[PDB]
RNA sequence: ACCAUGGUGACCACGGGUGACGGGGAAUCAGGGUUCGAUUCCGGAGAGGGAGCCUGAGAAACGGCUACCACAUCCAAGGAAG
RNA sequence: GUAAUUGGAAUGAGUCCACUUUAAAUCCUUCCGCGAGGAUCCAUUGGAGGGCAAGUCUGGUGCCAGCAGCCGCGGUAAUUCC
């Protein structure tokens, strides 16, 4: 039907729950700006392609 | 009712529009190739650069033969000649207008302890300052934003209390030599 | 003793106050803040007087050791040292002892002596036996 | 068009102080009757108890049952409606709590697809409605 | 107190509102402005509400008093204090 | 740049005298000492369709729950919902 007052809190109330698995911490602070300038500009790679961006899948 | 100063102004400025792709890119290579911590202290020195141009163009809209820029622009120039962004014998109020923020991030303490051969790897040249290892002639200072003058520029050195200029090795050398003699007499 | 420099500057003696007052900068290069009681004899063995009329205070060590700076002064007498001097630096080394009441006491003692009128035997004696 | 001239500034000023009464977001800031009208009354937040849970319907292109409550303010006491704005968050507001109703994105007007609502709900019973959805707090006893 | 019939106004009087203390100023800024200012500086006012006073050089003071009206305290209920 | 192996004239927070400041004390300033290997001594807040920098990667839902300031995405493969 169209759900008058029932199934309120439905889609989070039935979702499969995936554990947040641990990682390394991020290099916070000054070193983030170190490593991401290093991510973008110190290696301007000659890979062409109309420049597919920074979350390529 | 109080004996307080009250007086403060903001030092950095935030941009007109954010999220244009030809701003953050041409500003990111300030944050990395000169080794800074956050973009607020890029806007800081740029807003410092900005009002000097706003000063000088209040001054360039005046003519020839009036006394106020004779006091102002000369006192303007005898303060940024001594900081080393602009050399002495070619003093004009017109060369200052074509000037870029690459020179204000060149006259810091932090990039001059990289290019005077005192260290390596510009981010590391941040680290030595703040970790209390670098003195001015008599004064030890842990400030990367210390725009060190042209006058006191040949005088940056390691401290007398530094490892690299003095002694009493700190807690990593003391700890390792202790445990080796900590198995017998 | 060992590696300590004592210097001073802006020496102004005066006989308005009959003192000798100056700015002292103490150089301890890699050492801690020097005791003031050690400083108030290292001028006496320079000004040829006794460590009895040389008073120092006010040392704030500059950033990262080396030159601290402060005040110091020299009186012309120990009896001048008890006339023209605020009582707190007269007492940091014992020359005038100070144990009084707190001001919370002294106010409320006067607030209860205020109600009682005329009785000289019972203005002070407004409850000194009960406490 | 305009009368103009150097000496006519009385005409050009008593023409502006009454042609200013014809644009709205000035007029709901100086005329007074639109200052009393809002339930918050020149404020930014209000506390109020929950009287009724209701489900309103979404507007013309959508079709959903948007959930709302029926807060009645203790300041200048009068009935309003209010929106409880998250996924599993109907359950965290219960009957006759004390919630802090805030504005809803657009000042004085409903956003999106909820016809006839003006306020949203944060801080159910001293704890933030974010801080119950995000698993940082509970509803205290 | 005796006389005279005047005065103000569309160059907005008079009346109403003010979520109005005024001013130095503050936020903002191409120029032009729009808003804020209870707030440490100076000037005004008032110590719950309105009135009346003594002393002093200066107070219609309120960490001075007396009366009323609104609020409240002790009590051995005879009275006291705000 | 991972996955590394060490290190050492590297150090700050933290715990600790003592001097100092101060009226008396506190910060802070100085200075024995201890004090970093997933340096566990750990950085969040908001977003990722367009305005607006950043994903048609996966699972769940199925005009429901919900998102969205505006346009819009939602009806069994969603670049916006969990």
Swiss-Prot record, chain B:
Gene3D superfamilies registered for this protein in UniProt: RNA-binding S4 domain (3.10.290.10)
InterPro entries tied to this protein: Ribosomal_uS4, Ribosomal_uS4_CS, Ribosomal_uS4_euk/arc, Ribosomal_uS4_N, S4_RNA-bd, S4_RNA-bd_sf
Annotated region described as Disordered, given as residue ranges: 161-185
Residues where Phosphoserine is found: 152, 162
GO terms classed as biological process: cytoplasmic translation; positive regulation of cell population proliferation; ribosomal small subunit biogenesis; translation
A GO MF term: translation regulator activity
First-listed, main subcellular location of the protein, grouped into a coarse class: cytoplasm
Sites of the Glycyl lysine isopeptide (Lys-Gly) (interchain with G-Cter in SUMO2) crosslink: 92, 138
PTM annotation (N6-acetyllysine): residues: 65, 115, 154
Localization per record: Cytoplasm; Nucleus, Nucleolus
GO CC aspect terms: cytoplasm; cytosol; cytosolic ribosome; cytosolic small ribosomal subunit; extracellular exosome; focal adhesion; membrane; nucleolus
Pfam families named in the record: Ribosomal_S4, S4
Keyword annotations of the record: Acetylation, Cytoplasm, Isopeptide bond, Nucleus, Phosphoprotein, Ribonucleoprotein, Ribosomal protein, RNA-binding, rRNA-binding, Ubl conjugation
Domain S4 RNA-binding: 107-181
Quaternary structure, from the entry: Component of the small ribosomal subunit. Identified in a IGF2BP1-dependent mRNP granule complex containing untranslated mRNAs. Part of the small subunit (SSU) processome, composed of more than 70 proteins and the RNA chaperone small nucleolar RNA (snoRNA) U3.
Function: Component of the small ribosomal subunit. The ribosome is a large ribonucleoprotein complex responsible for the synthesis of proteins in the cell. Part of the small subunit (SSU) processome, first precursor of the small eukaryotic ribosomal subunit. During the assembly of the SSU processome in the nucleolus, many ribosome biogenesis factors, an RNA chaperone and ribosomal proteins associate with the nascent pre-rRNA and work in concert to generate RNA folding, modifications, rearrangements and cleavage as well as targeted degradation of pre-ribosomal RNA by the RNA exosome.
Family: Belongs to the universal ribosomal protein uS4 family.
Name listed for the protein in its UniProt record: Small ribosomal subunit protein uS4
Organism: Homo sapiens (Human)
UniProtKB/Swiss-Prot annotation, chain C:
Subcellular localization: Cytoplasm; Nucleus, Nucleolus
Cross-link (Glycyl lysine isopeptide (Lys-Gly) (interchain with G-Cter in SUMO2)): 36
Entries under PROSITE patterns matching the protein: RIBOSOMAL_S24E
Keywords from the UniProt entry: Acetylation, Cytoplasm, Diamond-Blackfan anemia, Isopeptide bond, Nucleus, Phosphoprotein, Ribonucleoprotein, Ribosomal protein, Ubl conjugation
Record-linked Pfam families: Ribosomal_S24e
GO molecular-function term, one example from the UniProt record: structural constituent of ribosome
Location of Phosphothreonine modifications: 8
Region entry Disordered, spans: 91-131
Comp. bias intervals (Basic residues): 100-118
GO cellular component terms given for this protein: cytoplasm; cytosol; cytosolic ribosome; cytosolic small ribosomal subunit; endoplasmic reticulum; membrane; nucleolus; nucleoplasm
Main location, first listed in the record: cytoplasm
Tissue: Mature tissues, such as adult brain, skeletal muscle, heart, and kidney, express low levels, whereas tissues and organs with significant populations of proliferating cells, such as fetal brain, placenta, bone marrow, and various glandular organs, contain significantly higher levels.
BP-aspect Gene Ontology terms: cytoplasmic translation; erythrocyte homeostasis; ribosomal small subunit biogenesis; rRNA processing; translation
Disease: Diamond-Blackfan anemia 3: A form of Diamond-Blackfan anemia, a congenital non-regenerative hypoplastic anemia that usually presents early in infancy. Diamond-Blackfan anemia is characterized by a moderate to severe macrocytic anemia, erythroblastopenia, and an increased risk of developing leukemia. 30 to 40% of Diamond-Blackfan anemia patients present with short stature and congenital anomalies, the most frequent being craniofacial (Pierre-Robin syndrome and cleft palate), thumb and urogenital anomalies.
Self-association and partners: Component of the small ribosomal subunit. Part of the small subunit (SSU) processome, composed of more than 70 proteins and the RNA chaperone small nucleolar RNA (snoRNA) U3.
Family designation: Belongs to the eukaryotic ribosomal protein eS24 family.
Name this polypeptide is given: Small ribosomal subunit protein eS24
Organism: Homo sapiens (Human)
Swiss-Prot record, chain D:
Entry annotated with the keyword Transport: no
Modified residues (N6-acetyllysine): 134
Modified positions (3-hydroxyproline) in chain numbering: 61
CDD domains in the cross-refs: Ribosomal_S23
Compartmental location: Cytoplasm, Cytosol; Cytoplasm; Rough endoplasmic reticulum; Nucleus, Nucleolus
Keywords per UniProt: Acetylation, Cytoplasm, Deafness, Disease variant, Dwarfism, Endoplasmic reticulum, Hydroxylation, Isopeptide bond, Nucleus, Ribonucleoprotein, Ribosomal protein, Ubl conjugation
Basic residues compositional bias, start-end: 1-19
Modified-residue entries (N6-succinyllysine), positions: 53
Top-level lineage group: Eukaryota
Gene Ontology molecular function: RNA binding; structural constituent of ribosome
Disease involvement: Brachycephaly, trichomegaly, and developmental delay: An autosomal dominant developmental disorder characterized by brachycephaly, ciliary trichomegaly, dysmorphic features of the face and hands, hearing loss, and developmental delay with short stature. Intellectual disability and autism spectrum disorder may be present in some patients.
Subunit and interaction comment: Component of the 40S small ribosomal subunit. Part of the small subunit (SSU) processome, composed of more than 70 proteins and the RNA chaperone small nucleolar RNA (snoRNA) U3.
Role according to the record: Component of the ribosome, a large ribonucleoprotein complex responsible for the synthesis of proteins in the cell. The small ribosomal subunit (SSU) binds messenger RNAs (mRNAs) and translates the encoded message by selecting cognate aminoacyl-transfer RNA (tRNA) molecules. The large subunit (LSU) contains the ribosomal catalytic site termed the peptidyl transferase center (PTC), which catalyzes the formation of peptide bonds, thereby polymerizing the amino acids delivered by tRNAs into a polypeptide chain.
UniProt protein name: Small ribosomal subunit protein uS12
Species per Swiss-Prot/TrEMBL record: Homo sapiens (Human)
């Amino acid at each position: 039907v169209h759900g008058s007052l029932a199934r309120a809190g439905k889609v989070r109330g039935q979702t499969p729950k995936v554990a947040k698995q641990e990682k390394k911490k991020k290099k916070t602070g000054r070193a983030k700006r170190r490593m991401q300038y290093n991510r973008r500009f110190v290696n301007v790679v000659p890979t062409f392609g109309k420049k597919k961006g920074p979350n390529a899948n | 009712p109080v004996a307080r100063s009250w007086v403060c102004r903001k030092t950095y400025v935030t941009p007109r529009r954010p999220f244009e792709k030809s701003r953050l890119d041409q500003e990111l290579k300030l944050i990395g190739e000169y080794g800074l911590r956050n973009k607020r202290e890029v806007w800081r020195v740029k807003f410092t650069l900005a009002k000097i141009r706003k000063a000088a163009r209040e001054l360039l809209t005046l003519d020839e033969k009036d006394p106020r820029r004779l006091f102002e622009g000369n006192a303007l120039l005898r303060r940024l000649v001594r900081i080393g962004v602009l050399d002495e014998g070619k003093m004009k109020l017109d060369y200052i207008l074509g000037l870029k923020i690459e020179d204000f991030l060149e006259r810091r303490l932090q990039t001059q302890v990289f290019k005077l051969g005192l260290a390596k790897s510009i981010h590391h040249a941040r680290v030595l300052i703040r970790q209390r290892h670098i003195r001015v002639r008599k004064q030890v200072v842990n400030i990367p934003s210390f725009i060190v003058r042209l006058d006191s520029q040949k005088h940056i050195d390691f401290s007398l209390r530094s490892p690299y200029g003095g002694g009493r090795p700190g807690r990593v050398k003391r700890k390792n030599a202790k445990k080796g003699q900590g198995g017998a007499g | 003793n060992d590696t300590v420099t004592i210097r001073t500057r802006k020496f102004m003696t005066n006989r308005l106050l009959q003192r000798k007052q100056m700015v002292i900068d103490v150089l301890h290069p890699g050492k801690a803040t020097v005791p003031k009681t050690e400083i108030r004899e290292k001028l006496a063995k320079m000004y040829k007087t006794t460590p009895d009329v040389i008073f120092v205070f006010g040392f704030r060590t500059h950033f990262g050791g080396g030159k601290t700076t402060g005040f110091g002064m020299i009186y012309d007498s120990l009896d001048y040292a008890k006339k023209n001097e605020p009582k707190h630096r007269l007492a940091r080394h014992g020359l005038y002892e100070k144990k009084k009441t707190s001001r919370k006491q002294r106010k409320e003692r006067k607030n209860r002596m205020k109600k009682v009128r005329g009785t000289a035997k019972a203005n002070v004696g407004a409850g000194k036996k009960p406490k | 068009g305009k009368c103009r001239g150097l000496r006519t500034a009385r005409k050009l000023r008593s023409h502006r102080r009454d042609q200013k009464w014809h644009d709205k977001q000035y007029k709901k800031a100086h005329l007074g009757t639109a200052l009393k009208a809002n339930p918050f009354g020149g404020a930014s937040h209000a506390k109020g108890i929950v009287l009724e849970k209701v489900g309103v319907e979404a507007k013309q292109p959508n079709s959903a049952i948007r959930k709302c409550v029926r807060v009645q303010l203790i300041k200048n006491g009068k009935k309003i409606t209010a929106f409880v704005p998250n996924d599993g968050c109907l359950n965290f507001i219960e009957e006759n709590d004390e919630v802090l109703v805030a504005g809803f994105g657009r000042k004085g007007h409903a956003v999106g697809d909820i016809p006839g609502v003006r306020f949203k709900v944060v801080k159910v019973a001293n704890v933030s409605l974010l801080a119950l959805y995000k698993g940082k707090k509970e509803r205290p006893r």
